[PDB]
Coordinates of N, CA and C (backbone and C1' of nucleotides) in Angstrom, one line a residue:
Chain O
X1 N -134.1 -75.2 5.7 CA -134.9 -75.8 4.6 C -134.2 -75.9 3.2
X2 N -132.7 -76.4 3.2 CA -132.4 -76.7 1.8 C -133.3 -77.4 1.2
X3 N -134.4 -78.0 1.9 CA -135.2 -78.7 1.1 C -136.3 -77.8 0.8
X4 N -136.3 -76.6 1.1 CA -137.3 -75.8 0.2 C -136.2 -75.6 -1.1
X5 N -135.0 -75.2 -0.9 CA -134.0 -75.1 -2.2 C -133.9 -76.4 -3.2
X6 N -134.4 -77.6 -2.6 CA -134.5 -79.1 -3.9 C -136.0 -78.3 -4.4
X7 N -137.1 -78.1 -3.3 CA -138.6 -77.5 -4.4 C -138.4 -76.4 -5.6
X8 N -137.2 -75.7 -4.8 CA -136.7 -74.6 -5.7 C -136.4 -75.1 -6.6
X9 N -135.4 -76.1 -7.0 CA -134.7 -76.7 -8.3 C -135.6 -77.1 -9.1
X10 N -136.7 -77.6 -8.3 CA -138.2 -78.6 -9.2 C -138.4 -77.1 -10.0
X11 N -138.9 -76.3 -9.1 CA -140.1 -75.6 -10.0 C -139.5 -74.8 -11.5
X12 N -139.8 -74.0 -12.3 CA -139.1 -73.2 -12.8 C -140.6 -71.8 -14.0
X13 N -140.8 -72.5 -14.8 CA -141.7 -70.9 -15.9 C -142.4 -70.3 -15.0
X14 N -143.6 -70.6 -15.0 CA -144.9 -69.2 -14.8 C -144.8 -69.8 -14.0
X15 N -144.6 -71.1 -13.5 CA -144.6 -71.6 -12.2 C -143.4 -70.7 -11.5
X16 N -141.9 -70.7 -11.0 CA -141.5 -70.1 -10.4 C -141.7 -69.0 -10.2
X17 N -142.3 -68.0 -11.6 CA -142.6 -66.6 -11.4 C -144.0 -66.5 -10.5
X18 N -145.1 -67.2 -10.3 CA -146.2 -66.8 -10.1 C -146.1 -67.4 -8.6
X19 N -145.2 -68.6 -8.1 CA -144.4 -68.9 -6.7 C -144.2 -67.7 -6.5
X20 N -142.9 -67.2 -6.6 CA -141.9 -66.3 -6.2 C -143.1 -65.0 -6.1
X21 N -144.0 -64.5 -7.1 CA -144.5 -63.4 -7.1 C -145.6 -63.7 -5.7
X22 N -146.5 -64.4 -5.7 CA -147.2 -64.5 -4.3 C -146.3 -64.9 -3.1
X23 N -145.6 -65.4 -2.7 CA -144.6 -65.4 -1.9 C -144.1 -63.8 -1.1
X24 N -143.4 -63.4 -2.4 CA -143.3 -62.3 -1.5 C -144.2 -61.5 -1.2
X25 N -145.7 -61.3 -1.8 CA -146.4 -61.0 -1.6 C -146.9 -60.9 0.0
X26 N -146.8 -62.2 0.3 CA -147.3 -62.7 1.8 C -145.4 -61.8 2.7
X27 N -144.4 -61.6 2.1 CA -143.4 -60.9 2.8 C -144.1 -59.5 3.1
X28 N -145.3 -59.0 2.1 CA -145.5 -57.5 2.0 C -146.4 -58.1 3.8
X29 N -147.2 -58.6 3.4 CA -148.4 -59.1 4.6 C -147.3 -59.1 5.5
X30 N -146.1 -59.6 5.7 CA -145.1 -59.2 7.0 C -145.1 -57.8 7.3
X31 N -143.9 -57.0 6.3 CA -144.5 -55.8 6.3 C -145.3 -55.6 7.3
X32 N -146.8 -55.3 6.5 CA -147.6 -54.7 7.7 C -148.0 -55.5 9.1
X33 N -147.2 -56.7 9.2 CA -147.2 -57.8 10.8 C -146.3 -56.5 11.2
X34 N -145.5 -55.7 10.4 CA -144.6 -54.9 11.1 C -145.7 -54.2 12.5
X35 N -146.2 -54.1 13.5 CA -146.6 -53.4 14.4 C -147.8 -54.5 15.2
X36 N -148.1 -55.5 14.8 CA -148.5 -56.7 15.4 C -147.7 -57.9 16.1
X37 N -148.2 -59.1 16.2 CA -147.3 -60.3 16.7 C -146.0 -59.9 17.0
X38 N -145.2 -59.9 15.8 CA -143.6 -59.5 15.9 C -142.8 -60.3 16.4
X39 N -143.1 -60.8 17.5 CA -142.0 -61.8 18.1 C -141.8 -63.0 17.6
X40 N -142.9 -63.9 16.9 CA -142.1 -65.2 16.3 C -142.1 -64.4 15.0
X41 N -142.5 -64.0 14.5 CA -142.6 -63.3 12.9 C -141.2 -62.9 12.6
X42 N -140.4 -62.2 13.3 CA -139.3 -62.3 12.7 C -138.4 -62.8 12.0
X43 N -138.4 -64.6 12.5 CA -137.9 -65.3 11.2 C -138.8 -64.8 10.0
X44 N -139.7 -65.4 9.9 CA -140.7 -65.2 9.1 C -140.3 -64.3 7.8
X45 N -140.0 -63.2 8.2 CA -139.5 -62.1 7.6 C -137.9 -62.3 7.4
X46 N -136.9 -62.3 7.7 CA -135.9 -62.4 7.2 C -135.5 -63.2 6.2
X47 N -136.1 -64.4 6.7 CA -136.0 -65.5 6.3 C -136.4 -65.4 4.8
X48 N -138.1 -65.5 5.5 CA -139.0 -65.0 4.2 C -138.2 -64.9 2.9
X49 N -137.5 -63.1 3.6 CA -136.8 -62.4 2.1 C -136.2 -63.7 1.9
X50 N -135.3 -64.4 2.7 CA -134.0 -65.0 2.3 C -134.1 -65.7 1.0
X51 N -135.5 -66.8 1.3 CA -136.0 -68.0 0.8 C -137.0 -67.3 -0.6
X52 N -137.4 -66.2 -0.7 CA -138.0 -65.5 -2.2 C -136.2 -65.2 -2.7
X53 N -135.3 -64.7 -2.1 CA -134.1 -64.5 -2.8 C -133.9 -66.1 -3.2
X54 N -134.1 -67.0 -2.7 CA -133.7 -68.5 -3.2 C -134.5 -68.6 -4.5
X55 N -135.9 -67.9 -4.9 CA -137.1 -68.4 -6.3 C -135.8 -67.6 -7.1
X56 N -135.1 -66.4 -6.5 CA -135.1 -65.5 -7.8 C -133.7 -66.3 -8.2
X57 N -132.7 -66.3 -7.4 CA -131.7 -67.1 -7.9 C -132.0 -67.8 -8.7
X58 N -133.0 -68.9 -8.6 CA -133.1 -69.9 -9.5 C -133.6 -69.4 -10.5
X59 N -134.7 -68.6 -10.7 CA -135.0 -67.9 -12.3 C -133.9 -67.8 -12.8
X60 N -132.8 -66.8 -12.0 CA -131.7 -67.0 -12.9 C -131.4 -68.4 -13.5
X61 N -130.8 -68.9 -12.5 CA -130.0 -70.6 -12.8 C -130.5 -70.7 -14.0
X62 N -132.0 -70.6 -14.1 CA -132.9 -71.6 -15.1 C -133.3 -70.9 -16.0
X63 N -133.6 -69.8 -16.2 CA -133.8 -69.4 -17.5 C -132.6 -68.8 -18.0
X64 N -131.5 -68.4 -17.6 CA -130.4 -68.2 -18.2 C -129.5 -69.3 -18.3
X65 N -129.5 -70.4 -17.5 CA -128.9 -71.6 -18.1 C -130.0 -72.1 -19.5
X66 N -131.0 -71.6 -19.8 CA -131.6 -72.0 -20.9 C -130.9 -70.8 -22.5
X67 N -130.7 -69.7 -22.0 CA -130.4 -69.2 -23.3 C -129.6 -68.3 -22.7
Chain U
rG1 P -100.3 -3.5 99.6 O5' -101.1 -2.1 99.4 C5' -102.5 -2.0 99.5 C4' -102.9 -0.6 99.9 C3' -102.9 0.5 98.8 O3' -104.2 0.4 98.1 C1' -102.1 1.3 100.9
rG2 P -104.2 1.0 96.5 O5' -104.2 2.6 96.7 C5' -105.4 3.3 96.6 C4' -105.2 4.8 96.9 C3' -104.4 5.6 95.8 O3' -105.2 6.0 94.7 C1' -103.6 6.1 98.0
rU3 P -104.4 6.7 93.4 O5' -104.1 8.2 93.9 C5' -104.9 9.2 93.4 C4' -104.1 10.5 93.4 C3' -103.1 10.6 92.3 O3' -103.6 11.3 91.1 C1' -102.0 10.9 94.3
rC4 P -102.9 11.1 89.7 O5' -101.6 12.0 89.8 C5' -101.7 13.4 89.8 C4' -100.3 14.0 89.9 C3' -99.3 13.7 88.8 O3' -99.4 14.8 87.9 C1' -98.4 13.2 90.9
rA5 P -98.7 14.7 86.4 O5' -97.1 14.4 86.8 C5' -96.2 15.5 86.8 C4' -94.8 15.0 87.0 C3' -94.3 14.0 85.9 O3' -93.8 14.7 84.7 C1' -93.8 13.2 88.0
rA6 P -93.7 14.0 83.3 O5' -92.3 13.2 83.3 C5' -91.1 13.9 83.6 C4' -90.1 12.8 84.1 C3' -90.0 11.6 83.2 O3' -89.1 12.0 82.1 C1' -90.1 10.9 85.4
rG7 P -89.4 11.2 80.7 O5' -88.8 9.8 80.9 C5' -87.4 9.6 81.2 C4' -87.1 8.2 81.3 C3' -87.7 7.2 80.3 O3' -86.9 7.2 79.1 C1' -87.9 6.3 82.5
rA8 P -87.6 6.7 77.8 O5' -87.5 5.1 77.9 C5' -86.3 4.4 78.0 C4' -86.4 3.0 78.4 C3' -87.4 2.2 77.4 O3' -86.6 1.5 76.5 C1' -88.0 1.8 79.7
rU9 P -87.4 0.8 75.3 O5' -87.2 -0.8 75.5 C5' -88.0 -1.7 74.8 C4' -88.8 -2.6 75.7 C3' -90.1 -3.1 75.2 O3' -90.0 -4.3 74.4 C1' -90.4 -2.3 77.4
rG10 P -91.4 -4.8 73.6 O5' -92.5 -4.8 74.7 C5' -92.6 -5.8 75.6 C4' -94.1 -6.1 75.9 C3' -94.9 -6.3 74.7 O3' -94.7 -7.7 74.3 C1' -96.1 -5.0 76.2
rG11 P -94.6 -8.1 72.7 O5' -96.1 -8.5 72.4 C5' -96.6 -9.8 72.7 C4' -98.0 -9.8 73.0 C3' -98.9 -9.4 71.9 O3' -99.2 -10.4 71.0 C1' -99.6 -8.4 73.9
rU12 P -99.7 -10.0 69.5 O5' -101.1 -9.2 69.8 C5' -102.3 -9.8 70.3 C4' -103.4 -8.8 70.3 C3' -103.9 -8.3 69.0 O3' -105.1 -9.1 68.6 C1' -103.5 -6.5 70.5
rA13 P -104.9 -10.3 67.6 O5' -104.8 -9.7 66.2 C5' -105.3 -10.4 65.0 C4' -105.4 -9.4 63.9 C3' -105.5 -10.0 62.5 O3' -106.8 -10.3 62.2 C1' -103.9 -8.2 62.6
rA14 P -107.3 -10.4 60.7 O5' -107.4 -8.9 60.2 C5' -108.5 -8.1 60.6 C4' -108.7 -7.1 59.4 C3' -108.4 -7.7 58.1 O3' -109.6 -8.3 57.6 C1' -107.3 -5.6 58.3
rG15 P -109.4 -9.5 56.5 O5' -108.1 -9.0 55.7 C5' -107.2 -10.0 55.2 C4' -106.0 -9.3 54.6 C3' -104.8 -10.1 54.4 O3' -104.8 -10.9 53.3 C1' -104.2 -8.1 55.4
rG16 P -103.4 -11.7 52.8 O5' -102.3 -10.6 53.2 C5' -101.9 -9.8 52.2 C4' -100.4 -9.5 52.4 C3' -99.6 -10.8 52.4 O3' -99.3 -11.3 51.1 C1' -99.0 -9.5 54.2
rG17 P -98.7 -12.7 51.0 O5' -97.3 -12.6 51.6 C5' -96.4 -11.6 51.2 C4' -95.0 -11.8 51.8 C3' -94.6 -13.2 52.0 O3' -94.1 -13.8 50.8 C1' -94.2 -12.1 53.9
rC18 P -94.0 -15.4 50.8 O5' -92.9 -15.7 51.9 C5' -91.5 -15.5 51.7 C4' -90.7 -16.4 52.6 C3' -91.0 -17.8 52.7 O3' -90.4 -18.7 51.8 C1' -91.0 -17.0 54.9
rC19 P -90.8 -20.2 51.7 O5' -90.7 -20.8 53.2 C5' -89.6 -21.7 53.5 C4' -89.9 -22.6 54.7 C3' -91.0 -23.6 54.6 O3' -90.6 -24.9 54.0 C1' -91.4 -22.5 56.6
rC20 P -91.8 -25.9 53.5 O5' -92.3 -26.6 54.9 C5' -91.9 -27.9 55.2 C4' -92.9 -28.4 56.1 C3' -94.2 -28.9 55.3 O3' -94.1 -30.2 55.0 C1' -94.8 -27.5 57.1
rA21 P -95.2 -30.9 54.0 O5' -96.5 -30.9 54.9 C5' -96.6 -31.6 56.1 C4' -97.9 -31.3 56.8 C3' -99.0 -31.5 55.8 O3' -99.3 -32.9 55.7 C1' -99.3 -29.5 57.0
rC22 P -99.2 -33.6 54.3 O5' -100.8 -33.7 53.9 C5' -101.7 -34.2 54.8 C4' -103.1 -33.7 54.5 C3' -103.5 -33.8 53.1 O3' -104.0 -35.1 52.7 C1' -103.9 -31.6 53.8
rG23 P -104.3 -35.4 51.2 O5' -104.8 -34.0 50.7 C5' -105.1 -33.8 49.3 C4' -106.3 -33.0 49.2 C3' -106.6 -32.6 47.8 O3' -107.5 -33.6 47.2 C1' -106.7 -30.7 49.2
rG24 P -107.9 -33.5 45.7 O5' -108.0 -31.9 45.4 C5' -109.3 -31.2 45.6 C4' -109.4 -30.0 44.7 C3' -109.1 -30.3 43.2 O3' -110.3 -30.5 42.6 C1' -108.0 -28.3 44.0
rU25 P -110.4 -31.1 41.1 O5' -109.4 -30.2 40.3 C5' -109.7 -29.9 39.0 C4' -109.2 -28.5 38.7 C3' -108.3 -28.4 37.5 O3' -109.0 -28.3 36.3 C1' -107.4 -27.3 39.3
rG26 P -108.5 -29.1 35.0 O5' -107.0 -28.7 34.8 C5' -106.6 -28.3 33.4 C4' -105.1 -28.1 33.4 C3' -104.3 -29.4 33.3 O3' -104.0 -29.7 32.0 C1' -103.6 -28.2 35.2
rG27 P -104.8 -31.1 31.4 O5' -103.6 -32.1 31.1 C5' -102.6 -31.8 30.1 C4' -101.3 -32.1 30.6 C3' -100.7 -33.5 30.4 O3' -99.8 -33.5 29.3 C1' -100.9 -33.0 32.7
rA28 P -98.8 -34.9 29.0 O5' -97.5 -34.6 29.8 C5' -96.7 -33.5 29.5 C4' -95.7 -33.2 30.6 C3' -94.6 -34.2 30.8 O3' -93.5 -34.0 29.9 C1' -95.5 -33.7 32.9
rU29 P -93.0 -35.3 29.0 O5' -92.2 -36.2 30.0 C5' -92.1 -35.9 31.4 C4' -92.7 -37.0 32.2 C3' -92.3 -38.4 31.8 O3' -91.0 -38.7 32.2 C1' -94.6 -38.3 32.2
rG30 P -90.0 -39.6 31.2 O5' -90.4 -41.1 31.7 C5' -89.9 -41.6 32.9 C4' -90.7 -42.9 33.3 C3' -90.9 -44.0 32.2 O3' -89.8 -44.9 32.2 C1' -92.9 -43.5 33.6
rC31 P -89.4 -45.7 30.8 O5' -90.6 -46.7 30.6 C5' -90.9 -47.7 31.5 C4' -92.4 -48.0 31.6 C3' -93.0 -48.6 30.4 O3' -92.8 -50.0 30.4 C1' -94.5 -47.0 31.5
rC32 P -92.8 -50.7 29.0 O5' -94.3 -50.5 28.4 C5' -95.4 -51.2 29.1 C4' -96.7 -50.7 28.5 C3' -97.0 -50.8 27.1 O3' -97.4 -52.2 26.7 C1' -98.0 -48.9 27.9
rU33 P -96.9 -52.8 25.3 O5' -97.7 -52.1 24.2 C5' -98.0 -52.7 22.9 C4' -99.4 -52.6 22.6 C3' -99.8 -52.3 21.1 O3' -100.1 -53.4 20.4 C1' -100.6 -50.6 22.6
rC34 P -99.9 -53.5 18.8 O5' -101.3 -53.3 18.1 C5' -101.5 -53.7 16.7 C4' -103.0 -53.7 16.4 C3' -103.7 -52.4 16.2 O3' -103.6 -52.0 14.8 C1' -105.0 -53.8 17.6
rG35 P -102.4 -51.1 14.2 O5' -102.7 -49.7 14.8 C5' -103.3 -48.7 14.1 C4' -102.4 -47.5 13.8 C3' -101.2 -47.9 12.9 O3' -101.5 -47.9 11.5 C1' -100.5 -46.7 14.8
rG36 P -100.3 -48.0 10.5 O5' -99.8 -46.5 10.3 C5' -98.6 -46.3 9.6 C4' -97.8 -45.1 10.2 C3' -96.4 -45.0 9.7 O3' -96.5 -44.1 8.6 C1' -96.5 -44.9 12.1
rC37 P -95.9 -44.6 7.2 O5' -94.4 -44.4 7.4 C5' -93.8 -43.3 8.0 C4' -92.4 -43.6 8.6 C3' -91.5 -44.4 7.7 O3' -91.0 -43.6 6.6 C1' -91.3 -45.0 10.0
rA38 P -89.9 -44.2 5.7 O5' -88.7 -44.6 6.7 C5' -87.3 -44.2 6.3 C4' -86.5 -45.5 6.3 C3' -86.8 -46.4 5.1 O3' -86.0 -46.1 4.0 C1' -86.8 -47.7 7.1
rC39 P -86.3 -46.8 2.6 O5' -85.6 -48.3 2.8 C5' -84.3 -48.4 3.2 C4' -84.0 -49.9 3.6 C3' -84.3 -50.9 2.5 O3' -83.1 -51.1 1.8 C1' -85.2 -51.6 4.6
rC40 P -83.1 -51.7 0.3 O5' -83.7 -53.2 0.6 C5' -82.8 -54.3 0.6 C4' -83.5 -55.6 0.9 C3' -84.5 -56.0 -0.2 O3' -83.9 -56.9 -1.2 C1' -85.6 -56.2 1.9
rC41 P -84.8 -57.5 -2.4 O5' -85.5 -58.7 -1.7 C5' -85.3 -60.0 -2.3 C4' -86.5 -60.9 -2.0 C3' -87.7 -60.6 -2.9 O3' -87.6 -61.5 -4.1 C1' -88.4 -60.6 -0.7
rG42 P -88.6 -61.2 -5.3 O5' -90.0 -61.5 -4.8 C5' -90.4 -62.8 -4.2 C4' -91.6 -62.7 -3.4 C3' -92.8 -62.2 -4.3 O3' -93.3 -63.3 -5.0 C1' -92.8 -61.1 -2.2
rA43 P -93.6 -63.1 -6.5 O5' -94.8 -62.1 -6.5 C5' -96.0 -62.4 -5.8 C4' -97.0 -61.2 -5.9 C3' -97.0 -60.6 -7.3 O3' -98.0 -61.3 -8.1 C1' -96.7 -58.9 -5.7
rG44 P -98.0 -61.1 -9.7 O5' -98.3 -59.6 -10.0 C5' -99.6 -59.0 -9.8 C4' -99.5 -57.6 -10.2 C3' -98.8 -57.4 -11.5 O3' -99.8 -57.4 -12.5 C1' -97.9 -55.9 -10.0
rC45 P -99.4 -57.2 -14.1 O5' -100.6 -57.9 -14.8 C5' -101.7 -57.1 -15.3 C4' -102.4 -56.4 -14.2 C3' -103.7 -55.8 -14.6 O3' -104.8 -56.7 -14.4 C1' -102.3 -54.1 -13.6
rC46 P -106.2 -56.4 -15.0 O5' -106.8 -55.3 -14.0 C5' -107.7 -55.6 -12.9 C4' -108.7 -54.6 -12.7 C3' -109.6 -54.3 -14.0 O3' -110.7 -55.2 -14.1 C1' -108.6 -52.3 -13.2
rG47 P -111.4 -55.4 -15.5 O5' -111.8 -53.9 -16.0 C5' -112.9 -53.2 -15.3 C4' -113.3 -52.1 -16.2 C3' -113.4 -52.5 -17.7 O3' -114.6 -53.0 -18.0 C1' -112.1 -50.5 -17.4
rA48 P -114.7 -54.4 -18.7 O5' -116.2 -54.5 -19.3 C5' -116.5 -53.7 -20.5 C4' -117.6 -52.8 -20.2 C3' -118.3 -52.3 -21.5 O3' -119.3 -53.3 -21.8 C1' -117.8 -50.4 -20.3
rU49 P -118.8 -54.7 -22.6 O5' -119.1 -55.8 -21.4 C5' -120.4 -55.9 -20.9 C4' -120.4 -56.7 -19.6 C3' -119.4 -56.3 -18.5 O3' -119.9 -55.2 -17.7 C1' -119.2 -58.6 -18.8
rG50 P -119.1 -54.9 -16.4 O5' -118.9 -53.3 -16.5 C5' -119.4 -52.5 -15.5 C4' -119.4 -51.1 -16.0 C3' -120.3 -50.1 -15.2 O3' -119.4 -49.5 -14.2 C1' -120.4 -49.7 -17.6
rA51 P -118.8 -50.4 -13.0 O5' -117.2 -50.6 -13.5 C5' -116.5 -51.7 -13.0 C4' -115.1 -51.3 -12.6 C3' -114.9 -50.3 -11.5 O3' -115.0 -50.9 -10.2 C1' -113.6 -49.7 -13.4
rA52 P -115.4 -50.0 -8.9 O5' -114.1 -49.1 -8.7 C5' -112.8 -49.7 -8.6 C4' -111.7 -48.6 -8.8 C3' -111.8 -47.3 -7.9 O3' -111.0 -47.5 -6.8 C1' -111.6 -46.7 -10.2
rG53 P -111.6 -47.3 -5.3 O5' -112.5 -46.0 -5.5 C5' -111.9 -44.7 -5.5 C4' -112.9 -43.6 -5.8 C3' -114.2 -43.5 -5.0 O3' -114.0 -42.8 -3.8 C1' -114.8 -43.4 -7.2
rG54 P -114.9 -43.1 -2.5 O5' -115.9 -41.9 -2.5 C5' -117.2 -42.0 -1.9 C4' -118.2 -41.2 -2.7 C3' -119.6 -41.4 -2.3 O3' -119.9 -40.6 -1.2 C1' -119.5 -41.6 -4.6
rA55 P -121.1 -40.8 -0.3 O5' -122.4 -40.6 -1.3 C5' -122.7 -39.3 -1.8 C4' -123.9 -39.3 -2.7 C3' -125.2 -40.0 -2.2 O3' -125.8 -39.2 -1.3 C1' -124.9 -40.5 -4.4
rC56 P -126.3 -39.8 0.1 O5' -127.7 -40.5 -0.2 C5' -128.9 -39.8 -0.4 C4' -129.9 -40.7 -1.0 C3' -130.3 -41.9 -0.2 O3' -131.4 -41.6 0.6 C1' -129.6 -42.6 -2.4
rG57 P -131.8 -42.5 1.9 O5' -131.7 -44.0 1.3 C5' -131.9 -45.1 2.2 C4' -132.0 -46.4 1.5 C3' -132.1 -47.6 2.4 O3' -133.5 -47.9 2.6 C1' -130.4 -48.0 0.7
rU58 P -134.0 -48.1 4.1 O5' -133.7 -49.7 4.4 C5' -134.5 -50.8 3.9 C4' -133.8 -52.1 4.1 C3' -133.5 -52.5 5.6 O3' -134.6 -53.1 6.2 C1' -131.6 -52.8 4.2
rG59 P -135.3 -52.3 7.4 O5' -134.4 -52.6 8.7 C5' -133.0 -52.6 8.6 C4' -132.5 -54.0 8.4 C3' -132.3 -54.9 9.7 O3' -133.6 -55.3 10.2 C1' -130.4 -55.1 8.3
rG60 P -134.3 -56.6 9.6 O5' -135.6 -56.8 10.5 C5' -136.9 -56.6 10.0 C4' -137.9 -56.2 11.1 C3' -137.5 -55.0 11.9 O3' -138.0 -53.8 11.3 C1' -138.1 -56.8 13.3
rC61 P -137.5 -52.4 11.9 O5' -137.5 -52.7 13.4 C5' -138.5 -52.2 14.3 C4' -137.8 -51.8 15.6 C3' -136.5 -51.1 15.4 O3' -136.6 -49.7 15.1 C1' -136.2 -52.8 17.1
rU62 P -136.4 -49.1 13.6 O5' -135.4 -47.9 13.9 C5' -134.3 -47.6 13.1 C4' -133.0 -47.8 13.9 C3' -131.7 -47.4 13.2 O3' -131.6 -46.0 13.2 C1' -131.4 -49.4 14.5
rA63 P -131.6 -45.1 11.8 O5' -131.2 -43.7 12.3 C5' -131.0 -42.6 11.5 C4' -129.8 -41.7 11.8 C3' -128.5 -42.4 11.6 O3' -128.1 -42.1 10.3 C1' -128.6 -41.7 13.8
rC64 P -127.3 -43.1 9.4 O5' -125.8 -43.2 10.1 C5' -125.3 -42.0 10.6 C4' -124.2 -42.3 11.6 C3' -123.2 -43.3 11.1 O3' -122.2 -42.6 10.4 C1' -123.8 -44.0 13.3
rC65 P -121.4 -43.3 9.1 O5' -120.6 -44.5 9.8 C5' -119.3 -44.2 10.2 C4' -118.6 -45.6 10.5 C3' -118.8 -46.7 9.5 O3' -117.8 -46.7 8.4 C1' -119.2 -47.5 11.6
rU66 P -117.9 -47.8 7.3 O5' -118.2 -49.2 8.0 C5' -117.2 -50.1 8.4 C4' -117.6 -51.6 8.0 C3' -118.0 -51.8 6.6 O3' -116.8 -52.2 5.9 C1' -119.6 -52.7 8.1
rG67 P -116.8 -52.2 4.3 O5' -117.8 -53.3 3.8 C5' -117.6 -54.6 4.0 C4' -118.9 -55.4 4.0 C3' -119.7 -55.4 2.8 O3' -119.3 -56.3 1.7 C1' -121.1 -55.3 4.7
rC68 P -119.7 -56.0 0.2 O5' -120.7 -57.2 -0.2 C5' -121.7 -57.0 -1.2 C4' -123.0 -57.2 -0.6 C3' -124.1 -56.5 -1.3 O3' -124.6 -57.4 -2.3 C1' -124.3 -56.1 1.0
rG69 P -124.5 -57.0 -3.9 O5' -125.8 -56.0 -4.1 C5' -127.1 -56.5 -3.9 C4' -128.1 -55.3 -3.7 C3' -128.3 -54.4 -4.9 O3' -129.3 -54.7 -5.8 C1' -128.2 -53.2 -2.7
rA70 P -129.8 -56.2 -6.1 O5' -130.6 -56.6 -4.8 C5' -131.2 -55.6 -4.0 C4' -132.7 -55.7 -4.0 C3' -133.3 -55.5 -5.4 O3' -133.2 -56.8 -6.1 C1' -134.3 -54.0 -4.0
rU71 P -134.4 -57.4 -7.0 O5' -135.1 -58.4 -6.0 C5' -135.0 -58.2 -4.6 C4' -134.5 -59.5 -3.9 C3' -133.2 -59.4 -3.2 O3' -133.3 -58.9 -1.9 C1' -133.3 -61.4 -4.5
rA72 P -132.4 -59.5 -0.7 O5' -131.2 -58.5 -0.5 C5' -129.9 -59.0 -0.1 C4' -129.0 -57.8 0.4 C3' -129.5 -57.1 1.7 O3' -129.0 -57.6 2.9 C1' -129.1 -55.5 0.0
rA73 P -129.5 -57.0 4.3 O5' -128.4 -57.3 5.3 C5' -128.2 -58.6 5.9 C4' -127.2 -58.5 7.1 C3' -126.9 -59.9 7.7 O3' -126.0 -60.5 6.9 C1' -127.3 -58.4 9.4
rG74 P -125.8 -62.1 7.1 O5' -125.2 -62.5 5.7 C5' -125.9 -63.3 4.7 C4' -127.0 -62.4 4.1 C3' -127.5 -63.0 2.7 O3' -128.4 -64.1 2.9 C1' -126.9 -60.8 2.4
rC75 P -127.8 -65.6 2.7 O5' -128.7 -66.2 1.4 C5' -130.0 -66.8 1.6 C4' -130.5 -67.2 0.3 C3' -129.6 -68.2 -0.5 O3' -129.8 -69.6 -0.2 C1' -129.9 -66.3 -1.8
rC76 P -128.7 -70.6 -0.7 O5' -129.4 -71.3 -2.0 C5' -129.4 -70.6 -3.3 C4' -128.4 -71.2 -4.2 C3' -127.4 -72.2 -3.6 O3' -127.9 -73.5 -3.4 C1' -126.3 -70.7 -5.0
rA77 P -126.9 -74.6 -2.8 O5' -125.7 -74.8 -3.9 C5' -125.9 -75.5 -5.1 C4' -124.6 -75.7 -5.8 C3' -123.5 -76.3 -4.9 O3' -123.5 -77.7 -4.8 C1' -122.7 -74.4 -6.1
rG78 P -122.7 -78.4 -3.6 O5' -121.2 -78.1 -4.0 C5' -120.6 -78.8 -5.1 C4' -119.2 -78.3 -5.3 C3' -118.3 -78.3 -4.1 O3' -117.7 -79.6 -3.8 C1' -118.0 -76.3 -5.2
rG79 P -116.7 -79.7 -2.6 O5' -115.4 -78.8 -3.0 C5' -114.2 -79.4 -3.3 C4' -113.1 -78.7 -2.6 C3' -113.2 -78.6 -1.1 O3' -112.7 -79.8 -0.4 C1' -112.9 -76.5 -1.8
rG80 P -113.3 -80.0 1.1 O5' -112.6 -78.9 2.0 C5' -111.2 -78.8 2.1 C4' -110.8 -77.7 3.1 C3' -111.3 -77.9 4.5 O3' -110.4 -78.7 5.3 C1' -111.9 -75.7 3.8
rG81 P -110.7 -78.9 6.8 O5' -111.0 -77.4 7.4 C5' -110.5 -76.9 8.6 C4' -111.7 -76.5 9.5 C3' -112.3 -77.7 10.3 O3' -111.6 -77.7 11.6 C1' -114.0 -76.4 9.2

RNA sequence: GGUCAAGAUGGUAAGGGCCCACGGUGGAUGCCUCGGCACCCGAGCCGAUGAAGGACGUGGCUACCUGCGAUAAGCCAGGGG
């Protein structure tokens, strides 16, 4: 999904933080998938983290390419 | 064929010794490397933009070895394939 990384480049203020913040929030909801489903969920989770590590990157990019 | 007397040698292993037989433990060692050694060209500074160097981590399932460090079997862009 580079193309969740172009949604990434869109978003950026309260917007990226309040994405990124419920986002991983639903990683925590993996978390506790920890002892349920599990078998497709796995991406889910890896991934998950990978693609909230993609919001935070970009906070960086963008608010420190701002000041 | 039966009795006595006289004379000389006999096989009998508990275990043991020497020789061969087939194994057992013990690794020589013959050969064999993703390991050293010696030289010679290359290369030659890291550090608070908190280094060298470790502590505690994460890999859905992981004690350990690796790599990352809480954005942690790693997210981004560009050069390779």
């Amino acid at each position: 999904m580079r193309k969740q990384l172009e949604e990434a480049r869109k978003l950026s203020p309260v917007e990226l933080e309040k994405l990124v913040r419920e986002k991983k929030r639903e990683l925590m909801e993996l978390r506790f998938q920890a002892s349920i489903g599990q078998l497709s969920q796995n991406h889910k989770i890896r991934d998950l983290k990978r693609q909230i590590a993609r919001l935070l990157t970009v906070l960086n990019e963008k608010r420190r390419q701002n000041a």
